[PDB]
Design a protein around this nucleic acid. Structure first.
Lengths: 78, 199, 123, 80
RNA sequence: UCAUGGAGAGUUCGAUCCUGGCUCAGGAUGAACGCUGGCGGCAUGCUUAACACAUGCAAGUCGGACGGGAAGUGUUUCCAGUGGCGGACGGGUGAGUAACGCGUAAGAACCUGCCCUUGGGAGGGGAACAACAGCUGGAAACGGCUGCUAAUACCCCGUAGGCUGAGAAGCAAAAGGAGGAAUCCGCCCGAGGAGGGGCUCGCGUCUGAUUAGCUAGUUGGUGAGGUAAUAGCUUACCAAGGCGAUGAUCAGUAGCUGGUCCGAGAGGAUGAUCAGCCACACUGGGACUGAGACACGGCCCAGACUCCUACGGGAGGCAGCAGUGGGGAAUUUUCCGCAAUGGGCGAAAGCCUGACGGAGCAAUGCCGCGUGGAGGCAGAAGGCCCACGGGUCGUGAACUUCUUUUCCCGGAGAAGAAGCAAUGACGGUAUCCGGGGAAUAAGCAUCGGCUAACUCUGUGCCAGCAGCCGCGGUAAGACAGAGGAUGCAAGCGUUAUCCGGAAUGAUUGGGCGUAAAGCGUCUGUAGGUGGCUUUUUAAGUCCGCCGUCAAAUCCCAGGGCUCAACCCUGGACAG
């Protein structure tokens, strides 16, 4: 499927980043496009992500309870 | 049921039910009171188009709801298609071929299993015929000439353009579904259709 | 109520069709035990002596139910079968009592509309 | 494995049977990857869909008794 | 062309317009009660107490794995026991579970007996444990020493495209049986596949803020362990994280979904039978074996409860099918059969299946059919009403003929059953033929407006009716009766629950001067919306193609039951 690109929130954990993922969604009964945020824990053995950078989440083998993704880099076609 | 009942009541109330239950016109010695004086609610008018339809074919009213649901369910003029699903009813055809004088006469004439259709017997008056069918007597009916009595007294009115009566080999067939002009009874389709809008 | 945010919070919801019989609370009609068989009067425009049985039910409520028809057999501590339906004239009477059912006989000598009163055919 | 077997699909006293290749642990009226066949024992046809029966028998889903007997009426059996 | 869909009425007031609420007309029930009740076809049949349960049955099988013994007199049938699979499927219920449990859609870290394909192997030894014989304990349930025995049962050595490890090195298996043979069923080690499972994740998944903080194996990291496999799965230490005003945590409710019902539509309510997934099996908690359970009819323990006891102890789990008792308004027979279908075992023969196939009762529902057809002087008998002339019951009946769906009395008589024959609970059922005979068969609501149907007698604010308005104090089209009429029809009504109507929670579709409603006004955070031109990516958007959304249902078209209901075959828009 797709990746889930999104900003890094706070990386005060080794090999671990929280990521806000912003997702538009049609609200069911009323027809707008409401955003919903959902933040994840991603893995990086390199841990080369500061606060505020934005990554892409890809499914991998689960590392902990929450850490079920590792994020590498977006493509960046502007 | 059948309603099996007093029937000049229904002819005086609904107007003359054509062919069904009489060729004799109503009130040969009657009607000498009961001024209507012109007050009739519109619901009474639409109700009298229900029962002008329901007694003329002898249907159960629940079965008439069934035919309206099929008539909506088909594509086209539901005011006409209701009078296609109630013309190609079998005992209406045996009435219309003159195989019986009245429609209870045809319904009873098909209850006691006197009609073969395409060589197979049909025991049920609510059978809906098709184009290009075959409607005959029973093999005993060349010895039981009740049908020939009905065909004897019948032929004042001829036939509508679906029927083809063969004189001695007693076979009647319908070329195609009956046209609205073809329908014998005179009534407004819209009045009946509007009435069932409520359900 | 804009389409944006006063209404993808919520509009509001209507409550229910509010129950027009707080007892009978499973389903339609329920066995009863007679406690009082007294008689009360309607509101001001009418004038009658309407004869109601205050009845304990098998549900867990106690409720004053009307007794239809003309004659009534209902003494103290008999068993009835109440049903819903609001008698307007009486404040508090919410229910009826079925006639012709268990330990509440049919009405005396009625020949018009017997299925509402539990009287078998004559003739 | 999968066991190609009939299932009753009809009214009372009717016995219109489908030939379905479901897993053998299922109840007799369950769900299939592909419902391949038909068998009407009163009097009618029997659509068979030969390539799919050869797919499953090529895989190795053995049939039951009378499914195998229907497969012995026609010349379905080729070992390729 | 598309369109197959949208109805109003009553009630505030002396009247009028309006807001607004209530009530009705329409469908649907797993329904209940009342009155009435001919048949047939197909469905449905504890919604409540996941409440106890009498009795029988619901899971076996294999002697072609093995040893014994017990009927029959070389020959066969059985059998408790050790083994082999099956008891994890099928059946039942929805208590819990607001959660990857479910639905849908992806993924990698796994397992997998029976099932197909495929590469190789089965030498050698050995010890017992049941059974059994003896003694003996117990009322039973069960045992306990003493010896003995066999194997596809156990153990050891060698050998292995496997495993461990960086390599070095090591480590690991087998079973025979049937047959004269032929061969077949097996066994052990690998390698795939199908199917079945175990996990993980995106999204969807009820209300309540008069519940605002929660969480310390908690959220991460490493090391050690552990699991079939990843993992705080577990443990020691380190880091302080993680969730939340877009509702965390708590409380309450609820099995979920294909679907059902309604609605014109958007969608609202709901999850019976049919089908898929989950959970439970008296209430709790454990583990064992196997491929697979923390196992409904397995084991062990605790708790409560019932039965037996000879008083020491035992035995038990109907939310399996029938059934009893209780609760309830209310939900059936302690039935027949493995003939089919589907399971399990077996080489086969066959065996066992309360799954399933049928039958019985119940108008519980949907559909079909009958209670007569045609004529009937217009003359009589009668009820009710009448300006006493008559009218109306009424072609209705009486009466004459025709017919026999059904009814009775007889005959015949299926397929369903599968190419070796035989093999049917249903059942002499379905269906057909013959002989009488209109014979055996119509009720229930309503008649003041909505709402079709109305006059008369009795009652006199009484008895009563009533869905809302309201009728009822002497001539009541509203109560009670009769006549008549109306609508329905083997049904008719009332009640309850749900949707409609209701634009009365409003996206389609409402309002806020005075009718219910603008915060007292202002600053501003989060958040929402946003000027113009040019360029770029395409997240939204649109188009093509592809995958999937099980089957059943709904829609179209065919086909089958004498039609319909129902069943079946094929197809597909939506989304």
């Amino acid at each position: 499927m797709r990746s889930m690109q999104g900003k890094v929130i706070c990386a005060t954990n080794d090999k671990t980043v929280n990521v806000e993922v912003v997702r538009l969604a049609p609200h069911p009964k009323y027809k707008r496009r409401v955003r919903k945020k959902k933040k994840y824990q991603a893995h990086d053995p390199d841990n080369q992500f500061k606060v505020g950078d934005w990554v892409q989440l890809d499914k991998c083998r689960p590392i902990s309870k929450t850490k079920t993704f590792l994020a590498v880099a977006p493509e960046g076609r502007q | 049921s059948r309603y099996r009942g007093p029937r000049f009541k229904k002819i005086r109330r609904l107007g003359a039910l054509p062919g069904l239950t009489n060729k004799r016109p109503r009130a040969g010695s009657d009607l000498r009171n009961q001024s209507r004086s012109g007050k009739r609610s519109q619901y009474r008018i639409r109700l009298e188009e229900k029962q002008k339809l329901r007694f003329h074919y002898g249907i159960t009213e629940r079965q008439l709801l069934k035919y309206v649901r099929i008539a909506r369910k088909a594509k086209g003029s539901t005011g006409q298609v209701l009078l296609q699903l109630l013309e190609m009813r079998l005992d209406n055809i045996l009435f219309r071929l003159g195989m019986a004088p009245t429609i209870p006469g045809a319904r009873q004439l098909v209850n006691h299993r006197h009609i073969l259709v395409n060589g197979r017997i049909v025991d049920i008056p609510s059978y809906r015929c098709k184009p290009q069918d075959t409607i005959m007597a029973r093999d005993e009916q060349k010895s039981i000439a009740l049908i020939q009595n009905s065909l004897d007294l019948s032929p004042r009115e001829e036939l509508p353009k679906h029927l083809t009566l063969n004189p001695f080999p007693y076979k009647g067939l319908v070329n195609q579904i009956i046209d609205s002009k073809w329908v014998g009874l005179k009534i407004n389709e819209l009045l009946v259709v509007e009435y069932y809008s409520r359900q | 109520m804009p389409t944006i945010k006063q209404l993808i919070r919520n509009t509001r919801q209507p409550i229910r069709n509010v129950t027009k019989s707080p007892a009978l609370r499973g389903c339609p009609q329920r066995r009863g035990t007679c406690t009082r068989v007294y008689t009360i009067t309607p509101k001001k425009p009418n004038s009658a002596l309407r004869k109601v049985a205050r009845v304990r039910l098998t549900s867990g409520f106690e409720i004053t139910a009307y007794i239809p028809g003309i004659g009534h057999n209902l003494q103290e501590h008999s068993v009835v079968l109440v049903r819903g339906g609001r008698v307007k004239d009486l404040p508090g009477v919410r229910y009826h009592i079925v006639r012709g059912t268990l330990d509440a006989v049919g009405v005396k000598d009625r020949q018009q509309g017997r299925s509402k009163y539990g009287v078998k055919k004559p003739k | 494995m999968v066991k190609l077997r009939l299932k009753r699909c009809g009214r009372k006293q009717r016995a219109v049977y489908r030939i379905v290749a479901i897993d053998v642990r299922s109840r007799r009226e369950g769900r299939d990857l592909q419902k391949v066949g038909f068998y009407d024992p009163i009097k009618s046809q029997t659509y068979l869909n030969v390539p799919a029966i050869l797919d499953f028998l090529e895989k190795g889903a053995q049939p039951t008794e009378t499914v195998y007997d229907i497969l012995k009426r026609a010349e379905v059996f080729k070992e390729f």
